[PDB]
Amino acid sequence: QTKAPTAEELAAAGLTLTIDGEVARITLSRPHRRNAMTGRMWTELARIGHTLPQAVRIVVITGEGPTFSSGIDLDMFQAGKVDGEPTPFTLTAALDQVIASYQEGFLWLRRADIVSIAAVRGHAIGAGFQLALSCDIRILSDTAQLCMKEPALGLVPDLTGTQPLVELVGVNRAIELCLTARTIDAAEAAQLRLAERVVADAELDAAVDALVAQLLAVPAAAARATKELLLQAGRNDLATQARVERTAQLARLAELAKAS
Amino acid sequence: QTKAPTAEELAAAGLTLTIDGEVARITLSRPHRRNAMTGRMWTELARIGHTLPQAVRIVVITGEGPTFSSGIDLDMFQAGKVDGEPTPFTLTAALDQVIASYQEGFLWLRRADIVSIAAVRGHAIGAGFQLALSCDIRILSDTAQLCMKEPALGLVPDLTGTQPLVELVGVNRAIELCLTARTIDAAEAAQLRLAERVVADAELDAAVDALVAQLLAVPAAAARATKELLLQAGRNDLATQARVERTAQLARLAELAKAS
Amino acid sequence: QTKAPTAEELAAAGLTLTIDGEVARITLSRPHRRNAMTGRMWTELARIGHTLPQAVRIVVITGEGPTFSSGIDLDMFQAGKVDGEPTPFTLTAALDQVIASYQEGFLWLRRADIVSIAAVRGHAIGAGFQLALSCDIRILSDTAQLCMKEPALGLVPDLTGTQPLVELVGVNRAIELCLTARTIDAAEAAQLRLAERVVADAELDAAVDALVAQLLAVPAAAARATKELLLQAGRNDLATQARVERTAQLARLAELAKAS
């Protein structure tokens, strides 16, 4: 709330944030720990989302080094403090609130006024896979490997990953992936629609930059209104969706006419 | 209402309609304008749907010439009359009603008692893509190119395209396609499930005729009842869908027994 | 209710059931009749599901011989008794109840505490295809052929197949498959996501055993909780699904802590 987290605050939580005009880049920045995630990292992610400047309309998430994220830092299942905050294992209404605070680090990636992109190389495991899933678009390196590992550890996926997983691959494949907890390669991810594009590792940065340029070339207000429409389409009946579309078009035509 | 539009009325709106027994063929018929669509064309499409004879159970939509449709005629964004009716730009409750009248040209393609097929060659852009999306089945030529262009023009898709797009390719890919407004080729369309079949251009008419023959070989009442069931499946819980299926089967068994 | 059906009772209904520890194997066992299904078979399937021991968490369904199932036994459309019970043709509230009893043979395959696998070779037609569809996972032999034949016979699919079909292939493809009643091969099934894996016929048993081993290696309670979450994901809004996930995680953390 109020002020954005500082670069120093973010560095202590394992993140870097750079903003250039309409594009924000968030980098997981603990390569020696394979970008293992902590509670503090998730709650700072939430803080970044709540305080981004209004002009930002694209958010790119990637990892420093060859691994996107190994998932949750195993110290989070020990008694003490991790990154200065108490672990779940320490702590049920209070645990419920902490988990809800962590989920807020992922939920904002669906906001209609941003397009979020995960640029994934190497392993995205567990919480790492759920971070990539929470983004609108995934661009994978040919090195990428994805795994919903939580059930293998006796846990469920609780960082908002279940819904996008089922939307991408269907409930049946989702069951297979989660209940085997198996690791899939980038070719398989592409086949299952988990990646919107797979490119050679050397080309991942250029592929993300090409997609950013394509998005910036579409006007901001139409992009936002259209994303808002698409997120409602699945759950609406057709008659309702047609009304919602029509309502949105009136606002576009209004803005365009006042503009000229 | 009451009488079907005449061939002369349809020709002035850029359409041809031929009916042979149980099959109706609607052709966009302005090849020199790349079958660009107008308000009058949409409201005549709605009139065709409301007055088709009861025996028609299949509807095939294609374009005259090498382009299915370039989308909305740019004159629709000018002050005057297009095809004899006032433009949106001329005109908000009244604009809401006009848009709703245009949507009715697309909505009826989902009726349970028809199977609608879009046979697409060359470009289907914007309103043209939404027409193809509104059909049950798309058969593409290898020449086909699809593009949701509206956001690039500062507009949203409001001709009922959002829901089938999300059902076909998933919300994530839908965001990518709409917010980049990019053009996809037929091979990509096939990969994304946007086309049920892609064939050589010379073979498009034969492919449509083969599919028509397959549909006609299934009895009309079972086809209708089954389409009605499938359209309800996504939004129902499993227990409810099983009840709906069972209810439909009682009616089939009834009709079959009275038949014999 | 109460006691499980005996092996003798099951054999008279065309089924075999073997249980080994956490894995139950149900085999359609009328190869000379291409495992054609009857009312008695469906209601025994329901009885198996209602009485399986608590320790069973995986259920494998396959056919004896080269055909999974030719679908409904044509005698079910004749006047008399089939397998000792009266046919639908004999018999509307009473017919409604009989059909609902048959559906219960398929519905239990979605229970959260089991993973159900259909191992399909040769033809799975009509009721046979709906049995395979009702399972969480399908592994196909390269010999497999699938067909939703009901509409061709003047019927609808009423054994709970419509919803999984639409979830797998999308409503549009579902319409095409059901309203043409056409037969698809295993390569096509794989392309359409109807099969989670296709393997050489000689390798089908090993492929199923590999998947079973993968499932058994994930703890039972996390598997169950995760399947329960995934089945709710499609119909929930994102905020609701995040709450459901969080609720499930509290129970996991509880059980794990009491465990240690």
3-state SS assignment for residue A120: strand
Q: Which residues of C, range 235-254, sit inside 8 Å of B by Cβ?
A: 235
Residue C40's identity, in one-letter code, is R
The rounded Cα C14 to chain-centroid distance in angstroms is: 16
Phi, psi of B17 (to 5 degrees): -135, 120
* Residue B168 burial (10 A CB sphere; 0-12, 13-18, 19+): buried
Q: Which residues pair with A81 in a beta bridge?
A: A86
Q: Distance between CA B81 and CA A134 in Å, rounded?
A: 46
My answer on whether C60 and C151 are in the same domain is: yes
Among candidate residues A93, A103, A73, the one with its CA nearest the CA of residue A13: A73
My answer on whether C25 and C56 are in the same domain is: yes
Answer yes or no: is B34 a known binding residue.
yes
- Please report the number of interchain residue pairs, chain A to chain C, with beta-carbon separation below 8 angstroms: 129
My answer on whether B248 and B211 are in the same domain is: no
My answer on whether C87 and C210 are in the same domain is: yes
My answer on whether C140 and C195 are in the same domain is: yes
Method of determination is X-ray
DSSP, res B72:
B
Chain C residue with minimal CA distance to A148?
A: C226
Q: Long-range pairs for C81-85 at CB < 8 Å and ≥24 separation?
A: C82/C38, C82/C39, C82/C40, C83/C12, C83/C13, C83/C14, C83/C38, C83/C39, C83/C40, C83/C41, C84/C40, C85/C39, C85/C40, C85/C43
Q: For strand C197-199 and strand C137-141, is the pairing parallel, antiparallel, or unpaired?
A: parallel
Alpha helices in A124-161 (DSSP H): 127-134
Instruction: Report how far apart, in Å, the C-alpha atoms of A46 and of each of A41, B64, C182 are.
Output: 9, 53, 50
Contact (Cβ atoms closer than 8 angstroms) between residue A175 and residue C227: yes
Structure tokens at A178: 């989660």
Q: Distance between CA B62 and CA B85 in Å, rounded?
A: 24
Contact A234 B92 (CB under 8 A): no
Domain harbouring C226, CATH code: 1.10.12.10
Q: Distance between CA B95 and CA A56 in Å, rounded?
A: 32
DSSP, res B112:
T
My answer on whether C99 and C227 are in the same domain is: no
Instruction: For chain C, say whether B213 makes contact (Cβ under 8 Å).
Output: no
Chain C nearest C-alpha distance from A192 (Å): 8
Q: How many residues does chain A have?
A: 260
My answer on whether C50 and C88 are in the same domain is: yes
Contact (Cβ atoms closer than 8 angstroms) between residue A77 and residue A36: no
CB neighbours of residue C206 within 10 Å = 11
Contact (Cβ atoms closer than 8 angstroms) between residue A223 and residue A114: no
CB neighbours of residue C107 within 10 Å = 18
- Residue numbers of the domain that contains C232: 219-260
My answer on whether B155 and B249 are in the same domain is: no
DSSP, res B59:
E
Contact (Cβ atoms closer than 8 angstroms) between residue B16 and residue B26: yes
Contact (Cβ atoms closer than 8 angstroms) between residue A255 and residue B156: no
Interface partners of C (3+ CB pairs, < 8 Å)? A, B
Contact B137 C172 (CB under 8 A): yes
Answer yes or no: is A73 a known binding residue.
yes
Answer yes or no: is B73 a known binding residue.
yes
Instruction: For chain B, say whether C193 makes contact (Cβ under 8 Å).
Output: no
Chain A residue with minimal CA distance to B99?
A: A246
Interface test with B, best of A22, A115, A229, A247 (most B CBs within 10 A): A229
My answer on whether A192 and A258 are in the same domain is: no
Q: Distance between CA A43 and CA A103 in Å, rounded?
A: 8
- Split into its structural domains, chain A has a count of 2
Nearest CB partner across the interface for A235, out of C115, C215, C237: C237
Write the DSSP assignment of A171-223 as a string of letters: HHHHHHHHHHT-EEEHHHHHHTTS-SEEE-GGGHHHHHHHHHHHHHTS-HHHH
User: Helix (H) and strand (E) counts for chain A?
Assistant: 9, 11
DSSP, res A130:
H
Q: Distance between CA C103 and CA C67 in Å, rounded?
A: 22
* Residue B191 burial (10 A CB sphere; 0-12, 13-18, 19+): middle
Interface partners of A (3+ CB pairs, < 8 Å)? B, C
Contact C235 B231 (CB under 8 A): no
Q: Distance between CA C254 and CA A154 in Å, rounded?
A: 11
Residue C103's identity, in one-letter code, is Q
My answer on whether B74 and B114 are in the same domain is: yes
Among candidate residues A122, A114, A146, the one with its CA nearest the CA of residue A133: A146
Instruction: For chain B, say whether A104 makes contact (Cβ under 8 Å).
Output: no
Domain harbouring C100, CATH code: 3.90.226.10
Task: For residue B187, give the H/E element and its range.
Answer: helix B186-191
Among candidate residues A188, A204, A85, A74, the one with its CA nearest the CA of residue A126: A74
Structure tokens at C158: 């009423």
Nearest CB partner across the interface for A174, out of C215, C230, C254: C230
Q: Which residues pair with A137 in a beta bridge?
A: A117
Q: Distance between CA C204 and CA C209 in Å, rounded?
A: 9
Instruction: For chain B, say whether A227 makes contact (Cβ under 8 Å).
Output: yes
Q: CA angle at residue C159 from C155 to C163, to 5 degrees?
A: 100
Residue A91's identity, in one-letter code, is L
Residue C32's identity, in one-letter code, is H
Contact (Cβ atoms closer than 8 angstroms) between residue B224 and residue B112: yes
My answer on whether B161 and B259 are in the same domain is: no
What resolution in Å is listed for this PDB structure?
1.9
Instruction: Report how far apart, in Å, the C-alpha atoms of B209 and of each of A36, B23, B25, B48, B215 are.
Output: 57, 10, 11, 22, 10
Question: Residue B96: its chain A contacts at CB < 8 A?
Answer: 246-247, 250
* Residue A34 burial (10 A CB sphere; 0-12, 13-18, 19+): buried
Instruction: For chain A, say whether B87 makes contact (Cβ under 8 Å).
Output: no
Phi, psi of C172 (to 5 degrees): -65, -50
Contact (Cβ atoms closer than 8 angstroms) between residue C24 and residue C18: yes
My answer on whether C107 and C65 are in the same domain is: yes
Contact (Cβ atoms closer than 8 angstroms) between residue A35 and residue A65: yes
Proportion of chain A in helix, strand, coil states, percent, rounded to 5 = 50, 20, 30
Q: Distance between CA C146 and CA C158 in Å, rounded?
A: 17
Structure tokens at C43: 């209601």
- Cβ neighbours for B29, distance < 8 A, ≥ 6 positions apart: B11, B14, B15, B16, B35, B64
DSSP, res B152:
G
Q: Distance between CA B10 and CA A214 in Å, rounded?
A: 39
Contact (Cβ atoms closer than 8 angstroms) between residue C23 and residue C212: yes
Contact C180 B214 (CB under 8 A): yes
Contact B156 A234 (CB under 8 A): no
Q: CA angle at residue C131 from C126 to C137, to 5 degrees?
A: 130
Structure tokens at B79: 């002050």
Question: Residue B151: its chain A contacts at CB < 8 A?
Answer: 218-219, 222-223, 226
Answer yes or no: is A34 a known binding residue.
yes
What's chain C look like in SS3? CCCCCCHHHHHHCCEEEEEECCEEEEEECCHHHCCCECHHHHHHHHHHHHHCCCCCCEEEEEECCCCCECCECHHHHCCCEECCEECCCCCCHHHHHHHHHHHHHHHHHHCCCCEEEEEECCEEECHHHHHHHHCCEEEEECCCEEECCHHHHCCCCCCCCHHHHHHHHHHHHHHHHHHHCCEEEHHHHHHCCCCCEEECHHHHHHHHHHHHHHHHCCCHHHHHHHHHHHHHHCCCCHHHHHHHHHHHHHHHHHHHHHHC
Among candidate residues C201, C196, C231, C177, the one with its CA nearest the CA of residue A191: C196
Interface partners of B (3+ CB pairs, < 8 Å)? A, C
Report the interhelical angle of A162-180 vs C204-216 (nearest 10°). Answer: 110
Interface test with C, best of B113, B197, B212, B249 (most C CBs within 10 A): B249
DSSP, res B76:
G
Task: For residue A62, give the H/E element and its range.
Answer: strand A58-63
Q: For strand C145-147 and strand C183-185, is the pairing parallel, antiparallel, or unpaired?
A: antiparallel
Chain A nearest C-alpha distance from B177 (Å): 10
Q: Distance between CA B194 and CA C173 in Å, rounded?
A: 10
The rounded Cα C182 to chain-centroid distance in angstroms is: 21
Contact A88 C241 (CB under 8 A): no
